[PDB]
Amino acid sequence: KELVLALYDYQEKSPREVTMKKGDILTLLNSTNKDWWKVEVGDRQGFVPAAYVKKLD
């Protein structure tokens, strides 16, 4: 889908989560949830706080 920019670093805390580093460019996979967005960071998928990323589009 679209691309989002990681505004903050985020280390996963649950099995469904994924780690990211500020500055990273992730592929937005599912933004149906207002609190967690499924993204692809590098070569891995998972959820990160919707609030910590920004849509570029």
In angstroms, this model's resolution equals 2.0
Q: How far is CA 4 from CA 12, 36, in A?
A: 18, 13
Q: What CA–CA distance (Å, rounded) separates 16 from 44?
A: 11
- Report the SS3 class of residue 56: coil
Rounded CA separation 50/8 (Å): 11
Domains and CATH numbers, the chain: 1-57 (2.30.30.40)
Contacts of 18 (CB under 8 A, 6+ apart): 12, 39, 41, 44, 45, 46, 47, 48
- Provide CB contacts within 8 A for 15, sequence distance 6+: none
Strand partners, 36: 49
